[PDB]
Amino acid sequence: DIIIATKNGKVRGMQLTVFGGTVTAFLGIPYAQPPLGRLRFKKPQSLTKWSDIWNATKYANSCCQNIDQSFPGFHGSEMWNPNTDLSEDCLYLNVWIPAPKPKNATVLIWIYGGGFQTGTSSLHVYDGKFLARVERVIVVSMNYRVGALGFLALPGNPEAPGNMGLFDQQLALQWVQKNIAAFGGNPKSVTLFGESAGAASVSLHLLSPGSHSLFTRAILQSGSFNAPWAVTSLYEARNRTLNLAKLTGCSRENETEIIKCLRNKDPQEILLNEAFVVPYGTPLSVNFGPTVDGDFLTDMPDILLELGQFKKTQILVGVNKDEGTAFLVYGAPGFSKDNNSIITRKEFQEGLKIFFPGVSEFGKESILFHYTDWVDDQRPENYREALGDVVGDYNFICPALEFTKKFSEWGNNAFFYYFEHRSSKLPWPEWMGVMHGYEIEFVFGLPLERRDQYTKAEEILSRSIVKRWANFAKYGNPQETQNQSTSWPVFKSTEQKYLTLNTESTRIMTKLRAQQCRFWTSFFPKV
Ligand SMILES: *[C@@H]1O[C@H](CO[C@@H]2O[C@@H](C)[C@@H](O)[C@@H](O)[C@@H]2O)[C@@H](O[C@@H]2O[C@H](CO)[C@@H](O)[C@H](O)[C@H]2NC(C)=O)[C@H](O)[C@H]1NC(C)=O
Ligand SMILES: *[C@@H]1O[C@H](CO[C@@H]2O[C@@H](C)[C@@H](O)[C@@H](O)[C@@H]2O)[C@@H](O[C@@H]2O[C@H](CO)[C@@H](O)[C@H](O)[C@H]2NC(C)=O)[C@H](O)[C@H]1NC(C)=O
Ligand SMILES: *[C@@H]1O[C@H](CO[C@@H]2O[C@@H](C)[C@@H](O)[C@@H](O)[C@@H]2O)[C@@H](O[C@@H]2O[C@H](CO)[C@@H](O)[C@H](O)[C@H]2NC(C)=O)[C@H](O)[C@H]1NC(C)=O
Numbered sequence: 001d002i003i004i005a006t007k008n009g010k011v012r013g014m015q016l017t018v019f020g021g022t023v024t025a026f027l028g029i030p031y032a033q034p035p036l037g038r039l040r041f042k043k044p045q046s047l048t049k050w051s052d053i054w055n056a057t058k059y060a061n062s063c064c065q066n067i068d069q070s071f072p073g074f075h076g077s078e079m080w081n082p083n084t085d086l087s088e089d090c091l092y093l094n095v096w097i098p099a100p101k102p103k104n105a106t107v108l109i110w111i112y113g114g115g116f117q118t119g120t121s122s123l124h125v126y127d128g129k130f131l132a133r134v135e136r137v138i139v140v141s142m143n144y145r146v147g148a149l150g151f152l153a154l155p156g157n158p159e160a161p162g163n164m165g166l167f168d169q170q171l172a173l174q175w176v177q178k179n180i181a182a183f184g185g186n187p188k189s190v191t192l193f194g195e196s197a198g199a200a201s202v203s204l205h206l207l208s209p210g211s212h213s214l215f216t217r218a219i220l221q222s223g224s225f226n227a228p229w230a231v232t233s234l235y236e237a238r239n240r241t242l243n244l245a246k247l248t249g250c251s252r253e254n255e256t257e258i259i260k261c262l263r264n265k266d267p268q269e270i271l272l273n274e275a276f277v278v279p280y281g282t283p284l285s286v287n288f289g290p291t292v293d294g295d296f297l298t299d300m301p302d303i304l305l306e307l308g309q310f311k312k313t314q315i316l317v318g319v320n321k322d323e324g325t326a327f328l329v330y331g332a333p334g335f336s337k338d339n340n341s342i343i344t345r346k347e348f349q350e351g352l353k354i355f356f357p358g359v360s361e362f363g364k365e366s367i368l369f370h371y372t373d374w375v376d377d378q379r380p381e382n383y384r385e386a387l388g389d390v391v392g393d394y395n396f397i398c399p400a401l402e403f404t405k406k407f408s409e410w411g412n413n414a415f416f417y418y419f420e421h422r423s424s425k426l427p428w429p430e431w432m433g434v435m436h437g438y439e440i441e442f443v444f445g446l447p448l449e450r451r452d453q454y455t456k457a458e459e460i461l462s463r464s465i466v467k468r469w470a471n472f473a474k475y476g477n478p479q480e481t482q483n484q485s486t487s488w489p490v491f492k493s494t495e496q497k498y499l500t501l502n503t504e505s506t507r508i509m510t511k512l513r514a515q516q517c518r519f520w521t522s523f524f525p526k527v
């Protein structure tokens, strides 16, 4: 029996066998008052102590959310769907500690992605027991509110101020500061890491002054706040709140009376109406997301980034070779996970309408002009690949590179990676390549389990990534120093060196996607 005294009461964990060793897991520790009733849409409230022993021996409820229904029975999509009951009562976190109890272990805190509308910390690919077993770090992950319940915004109104899911994250970072020393962790050595919207969340904690003292360093996998989907204007946020108010029958002159009416609606009526709150949506629509609330985020974050107003520390940032392909089978004409998806020029132009609905004719022609200058115009997958690269460069790769450039300009060490290995177990077809989200299982060390169907070269790759991430968190420097590995150079705004991650040979390269990102980052914001 393993019982740990926290600030709010005792918690009981469970022992797990991992690679002929042992890890102690505490699953489903509450870190806030359940945000129900009059607490729905408000910032998370502190917890009243308990006197029994809280049993933290199973994952908790995931937060309310809509579920992807495009491919029922298909593991490629269903592996991202929540795997515990959905409930508003979802403000819980998990802790994996090495056995025997460490003395002053570095702490890694995971923030999951999902477009700020979906996600849960209990997914199989987020299991922290391997990192705890192999590197002797402590791993923490939390559930935070998503969709309208996490991000509905009436700017300035405490009954629905916005950014509630971000304050959920922040209250969990505070829980670690106040309690992790009792688990053997070092609260002065905490690294946040996250992917997609989780990575955008990490980047906003670098900018929020209320998070400054709650972590040391940051890792951003395939996301950053300057991505076009990641921050919502106060303009759209207000239009979106009122549109939801109309859809549920809650239109009222007194703004606060709207929130009260929305608080007597069942979670399912809210969830079903989130989608139509926007006139035209895309596969990357973030109906309810982060806003400039004047609290978590004190100014538009492009301005904070440009003018150097962020926590000065080291960052690790990276992207995957085929970020864009996953979204093509969720609406682009002629695309299918079940054939090779060779599209024509006409289908390509229609795909741009789907992904850029509010963009002028000239705006769409300029995308086409820049991405259809083939070497061999006979290659039948020309248009299929162009649309993938368009979606990935615009939405993930060029924002992450620009974030890294601007951040490094204020004097801190940054390290950039390009992940280009396609999992041998990947259920999606080969044309989709090295997809968004499929580096995560290598970061968490699932290929170190010989019992799965991963190759020997993938065990080797994951082992190296796990050491680099852990060395970054402990020491600020993501080297693998023992096995004659390639040295990872610092990313500077001048030379812009990055490291490639693959099973063949890691290489140092310069100026990733230079020509493409000049288009997206300089020209296209004007249109
Ligand atoms: C656990 O270790 C900390 C030191 O953490 C390191 O220093 C940080 C600056 C950061 O770089 C981390 O990544 C490092 O791992 C010890 O902190 C000391 O605490 C005493 C008393 O509180 C204080 O007088 C010292 O100045 C602190 N030292 C530093 C460098 O800040 C802490 O005591 C250790 N705790 C245990 C139980 O071993
Ligand atoms: C701001 O919202 C209005 C209203 O949205 C409509 O009603 C909501 C309940 C929801 O069902 C939306 O999907 C609806 O569109 C938007 O006004 C509509 O705009 C579309 C096209 O832009 C038009 O076809 C509708 O007739 C408009 N309806 C009304 C009542 O004016 C408006 O576009 C939104 N603002 C922005 C900038 O998009
Ligand atoms: C690749 O598949 C898409 C999608 O086709 C669907 O999946 C299969 C079960 C197929 O057998 C059809 O029953 C399904 O519709 C194909 O796109 C469709 O093409 C037809 C033209 O014949 C068109 O009428 C549909 O609207 C298209 N559907 C969508 C969603 O765009 C596509 O033609 C296939 N490509 C190749 C190269 O085979």
Ligand SMILES: C#CCN1CCN(CCCOc2cccc3ccc(/C=[N+](\[O-])C(C)(C)C)nc23)CC1
Residues within 6 Å of the ligand: 068, 080, 113, 114, 115, 116, 117, 118, 196, 197, 229, 283, 284, 285, 286, 326, 327, 330, 436, 437
């Ligand atoms: C996969 C995939 C494709 N699908 C797209 C649509 N999604 C519908 C619900 C909302 O998801 C999202 C909406 C908007 C922007 C988004 C950006 C990134 C992501 C990333 N992820 O979801 C994971 C964590 C990698 C699985 N999701 C976003 C379901 C996933």
Ligand SMILES: *[C@@H]1O[C@H](CO[C@@H]2O[C@@H](C)[C@@H](O)[C@@H](O)[C@@H]2O)[C@@H](O)[C@H](O)[C@H]1NC(C)=O
Residues within 6 Å of the ligand: 055
């Ligand atoms: C909390 O757990 C206490 C200990 O029981 C443990 O859990 C059971 C399921 C066995 O698997 C074994 O590992 C332990 O004996 C219980 O005595 C206590 O009642 C539990 N509390 C609540 C509220 O259920």
Ligand SMILES: CC(=O)N[C@H]1[C@H]([C@H](O)[C@H](O)CO)O[C@@](O)(C(=O)O)C[C@@H]1O
Residues within 6 Å of the ligand: 061, 085, 086, 087
């Ligand atoms: C929404 C939800 O998950 N509710 C509760 C579930 C179900 O009520 C039952 O398992 C029957 O479905 O049961 C628990 O009490 C349990 O048995 O550990 C945990 C949880 O609080």
Ligand SMILES: *[C@@H]1O[C@H](CO)[C@@H](O)[C@H](O)[C@H]1NC(C)=O
Residues within 6 Å of the ligand: 254, 255, 256, 257
């Ligand atoms: C709205 O109603 C609340 C509660 O009755 C009240 O405190 C607030 O002042 C009202 N505001 C307006 C503008 O009527």
Ligand SMILES: *[C@@H]1O[C@H](CO)[C@@H](O)[C@H](O)[C@H]1NC(C)=O
Residues within 6 Å of the ligand: 463, 464, 467, 480, 482, 483
């Ligand atoms: C270094 O190589 C040895 C070879 O036996 C291997 O066992 C070990 O896991 C490697 N370490 C890393 C960090 O890759």
Ligand SMILES: [Cl-]
Residues within 6 Å of the ligand: 036, 037, 038, 039
């Ligand atoms: Cl209540």
Ligand SMILES: [Cl-]
Residues within 6 Å of the ligand: 366, 369, 370, 519
């Ligand atoms: Cl161009």
Ligand SMILES: [Cl-]
Residues within 6 Å of the ligand: 345, 377
């Ligand atoms: Cl052509």
Ligand SMILES: [Cl-]
Residues within 6 Å of the ligand: 518, 519, 523
């Ligand atoms: Cl150009």
